[PDB]
Recover the amino acids of this structure.
């Protein structure tokens, strides 16, 4: 209400969900072929056998323990569901970022109501209350204070934007490597093979 | 502002009512609601193609003031179509504009359903050799600013006044020098991977592969390849 | 170079014979791609958008500093010479104080954005150096790190303030459907391919590679036995050729 | 106050440009993270994944 | 395990009889440190017989 607005993102939640659904469908139906060009269908059992070969396990292990592997995967997905449903603070990074932005905005809003050495922090009172010369010098003091506050807010916003850009670059690299293919880097896409 | 009927209950000893930010919200009972305000953006396809523009009022329900309403506000001067195309001019909330000016919803991509089924695979029978161009900045122009000269401009009294303001000029000069040496180090680490300058043989027989267009040319324009010459001529300093 | 290209084909899981059968086709495709890049760079503009953007950002920052140098900052004049020549030492001192405060604030702000941009450019240069090390000096197995498809190699070129990587990559095309099976049942034993995939065109079963269609007859040399046909889901009955009985007989 | 600030300088333009650049950067991050694939794939109606 | 020698994979226990098919020969056994004496099955003699 004081010149502070929140621009809606270009990509809405529905389209981001559609992106994730398309990526998941390509991964399940094709694996890594869709990330290198046209998608190629695979029964996803032979794809998992190929992934086992990549990690260093022969296809016979999977073709003999497919039921056990599927049961373990389903149990792990259920455990993740239970952890996300019951245990809290599972999204600490996103919550921390949101609270950081909110705290910065609230700090700027509070700084908007500071005297900065003036008679009063309300500009309209000064204008309707005082004659041009010293009213102008008091307005100048208020402008200096508010400009300093907004400049430091912009500086920290730029720093946080750089941090978020680095995090997003890391996330894009993970999506390109972990999701669109099989990554041989250790601990890049989770602990273990 | 706008005086509105207030559902809030004020105690008999209360005269004003302030919300967050310690700003006046209600006055003895009438609520103060600042009248409609917001930003105004102009969507244009470039002065070359046409002079027609569209006006976007964000965070404003312009029913009070080819009108289309979106989660990003409201657009005037662009027709709304029910089709979907690639996003040309991003407006927001999934709404984009293109060139009359048309406003639509950005299409996420071509929709297809892969023929998934067990005991069935798709195997390529041919290959394509695709070369993709990727551009990465390595460094930027190194600039040095003389703080004393910039602030003063050949004045001794200003220099004396700046001297007792502290060593801000030294800090700025050190930061600029660090930036310059950082750019130099970035260029060195990017372009000095090898310690030996290898030369191609005079005869070029690489099994049919032709690299004369990426190798230096006999014309010797600063010993730059043809593609490098095109890249240099594309950027205007 | 043909042997190096065959090595890189082996890196992406394609045998050397696929290359040696179509060496001329691969060379022609590479030349056509180079010519296409030439045509795109000659005709299409804004291909170097990142370098232009950073250069424009630096120029805009410098121009903003120059323009801000001509601000009164609450003083009578924006030029110091006039104030010095017009005012007595105390009033001139006050005006110079105001001017220096304004100009120092502007310079500190400009230096702050310059440092932020320098950090961003350093990150970009580190990424470029990593790409040069892992794609120009070798073959990268990372997906989409150095192009869309299976990476083959990369070529570096200079740019006024950057590096241009021409990533040569392998893209599958002209795909056909086939019927598969996890293993082959022969003599009560399950056979799995050493490397590749079991496929069928409708009547006959072959074994080939995943990234290319090179059908071959089922043989004990390219298959291994790891049990019976009672545990594998999707077993398909077929004969397995033994390249020893005809030699013995 | 508007006259006094325009007499002060042109910081507001730089600040608005920085904020717009930050917003465009955020949009670019979202696009590069989520819009890697140009084709939308749909899972088959039959859920037979072994 | 205690008496018999097999060859397996690194990440899984799938013992198999030592054979010339899954093993390769390189020089004599007077240089390798820690080599042990064991028989190597040749899957051609039973076929000939
Ligand atoms: C508009 O752009 C085209 C690009 O093909 C150019 O040929 C033409 O001269 C431009 N027009 C103006 C008025 O700049
Ligand atoms: C704008 O106001 C109209 C009526 O005044 C209302 O129907 C409409 O929903 C409002 N817009 C939004 C986005 O809520
Ligand atoms: C065409 O687009 C208009 C938007 O102006 C919409 O109201 C209408 O329903 C669309 N027609 C369809 C979806 O058949
Ligand atoms: C065969 O492959 C094509 C694409 O290559 C696919 O659209 C089709 O569903 C497949 N099956 C057929 C034609 O029975
Ligand atoms: C593969 O495609 C090339 C053109 O890119 C063509 O000349 C060649 O005949 C094709 N090969 C097959 C087996 O279809
Ligand atoms: C490489 O291409 C250029 C232009 O396409 C041509 O002039 C040159 O002769 C070619 N080199 C060979 C060895 O064919
Ligand atoms: C499958 O391939 C074999 C040998 O390549 C051939 O004899 C047979 O006719 C083919 N069948 C079909 C249906 O194409
Ligand atoms: C494929 O699925 C069908 C039914 O879903 C089943 O009858 C058949 O045995 C399966 N084949 C393989 C190889 O999994
Ligand atoms: C494969 O052959 C075995 C014995 O030869 C038989 O018991 C089994 O039913 C066969 N399977 C199929 C799918 O024909
Ligand atoms: C080791 O394994 C072999 C084969 O399974 C068996 O014959 C032998 O008794 C085992 N020895 C011990 C000590 O377990
Ligand atoms: C292991 O070390 C012992 C001494 O502790 C030695 O007797 C034995 O020969 C060594 N074996 C190998 C395989 O190195
Ligand atoms: C293995 O056998 C050879 C001769 O057959 C013998 O010289 C050698 O000592 C044996 N190895 C051990 C560890 O006893």
């Amino acid at each position: 209400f004081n010149g502070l607005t929140v621009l809606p993102p270009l990509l809405t939640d529905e389209m981001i969900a559609q992106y994730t659904s398309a990526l998941l469908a390509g991964t399940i139906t094709s694996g890594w072929t869709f990330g290198a060009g046209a998608a190629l269908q695979i029964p996803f059992a032979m794809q998992m056998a190929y992934r086992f070969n990549g990690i260093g396990v022969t296809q016979n292990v999977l073709y003999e323990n497919q039921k056990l592997i599927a049961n373990q995967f389903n149990s792990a997905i259920g455990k993740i569901q239970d952890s996300l449903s019951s245990t809290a603070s599972a999204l600490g990074k996103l919550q921390d970022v949101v609270n950081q932005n909110a705290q910065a905005l609230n700090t700027l809003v509070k700084q908007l109501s500071s005297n900065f050495g003036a008679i009063s922090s309300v500009l309209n009172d000064i204008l309707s209350r005082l004659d041009p010369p010293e009213a102008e010098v008091q307005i100048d003091r208020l402008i200096t204070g508010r400009l300093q506050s907004l400049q430091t807010y912009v500086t920290q916003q730029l720093i946080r934007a750089a941090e978020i850009r680095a995090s997003a670059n890391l996330a894009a690299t993970k999506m390109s490597e972990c999701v669109l293919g099989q990554s041989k880097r250790v601990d890049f896409c989770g602990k273990g093979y | 502002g706008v005086l509105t009927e207030s559902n809030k209950k004020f105690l008999p000893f209360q005269q004003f009512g302030r919300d967050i930010a310690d700003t006046t919200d209600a006055v003895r009972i009438l609520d103060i609601t600042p009248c409609s305000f917001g930003g105004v953006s102009v969507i244009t396809p470039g002065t070359n193609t046409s002079n027609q523009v569209a006006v976007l009022y964000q965070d404003v329900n312009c029913t009070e003031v080819n009108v289309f309403q979106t989660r990003a506000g409201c657009l005037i001067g662009a027709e709304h179509v029910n089709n979907s195309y690639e996003c040309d001019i991003p407006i927001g909330a999934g709404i984009c504009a293109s060139y009359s000016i048309i406003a639509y919803t950005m299409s996420l991509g071509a929709e297809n359903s892969v023929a998934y089924s067990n005991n069935s695979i798709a195997i390529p029978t041919n290959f394509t050799i695709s070369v993709t161009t990727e551009i990465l900045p390595v460094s930027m122009t190194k600039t040095s600013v003389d703080c004393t000269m910039y602030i003063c401009g050949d004045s001794t009294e200003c220099s004396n006044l700046l001297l007792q303001y502290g060593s801000f000029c030294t800090q700025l000069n050190r930061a600029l020098t660090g930036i310059a040496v950082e750019q130099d180090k970035n260029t060195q680490e990017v372009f000095a991977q090898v310690k030996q300058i290898y030369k191609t043989p005079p005869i070029k027989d690489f099994g049919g592969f032709n690299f004369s267009q990426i190798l230096p040319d006999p014309s010797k324009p600063s010993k730059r390849s043809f593609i490098e010459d095109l890249l240099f001529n594309k950027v205007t300093l | 170079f043909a042997m190096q290209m065959a090595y890189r084909f082996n890196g992406i899981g394609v045998t050397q014979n696929v290359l040696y059968e179509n060496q001329k086709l691969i060379a022609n495709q590479f030349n056509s791609a180079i010519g296409k890049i030439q045509d795109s760079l000659s005709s299409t503009a804004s291909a170097l958008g990142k370098l232009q953007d950073v250069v424009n950002q630096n120029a805009q920052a410098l121009n903003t500093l120059v323009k801000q140098l001509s601000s009164n900052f609450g003083a009578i004049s924006s030029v110091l010479n006039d104030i010095l020549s017009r005012l007595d030492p105390p009033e001139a001192e006050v005006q110079i104080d105001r001017l220096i405060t304004g100009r120092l604030q502007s310079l500190q702000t400009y230096v702050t954005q310059q440092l932020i941009r320098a950090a961003e450019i350093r990150a970009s240069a580190n990424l470029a150096a990593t790409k040069m090390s892992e794609c120009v000096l070798g073959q990268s197995k990372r997906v989409d790190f150095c192009g869309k498809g299976y990476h083959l190699m990369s070529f570096p070129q200079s740019a006024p303030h950057g590096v241009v990587f021409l990533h040569v990559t392998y893209v599958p095309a002209q795909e056909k459907n086939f019927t598969t099976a996890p293993a082959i049942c022969h003599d009560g034993k399950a056979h799995f391919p050493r490397e590749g995939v079991f496929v069928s065109n409708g009547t006959h079963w072959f074994v080939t590679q995943r990234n290319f269609y090179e059908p071959q007859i089922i043989t004990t040399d390219n298959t291994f036995v790891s049990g019976n046909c009672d545990v594998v889901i999707g077993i398909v009955n077929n004969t397995v050729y033994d390249p020893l009985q005809p030699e013995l007989d």
About this structure: The pocket of 2-acetamido-2-deoxy-beta-D-glucopyranose (ligand 11) is lined by residues E 34 (CB under 6 Å). The longest strand of chain C covers residues 162-178. Residues 89-136 of chain C form the longest helix (48 residues). Chain C touches chain D through 14 residues (CB under 8 Å).
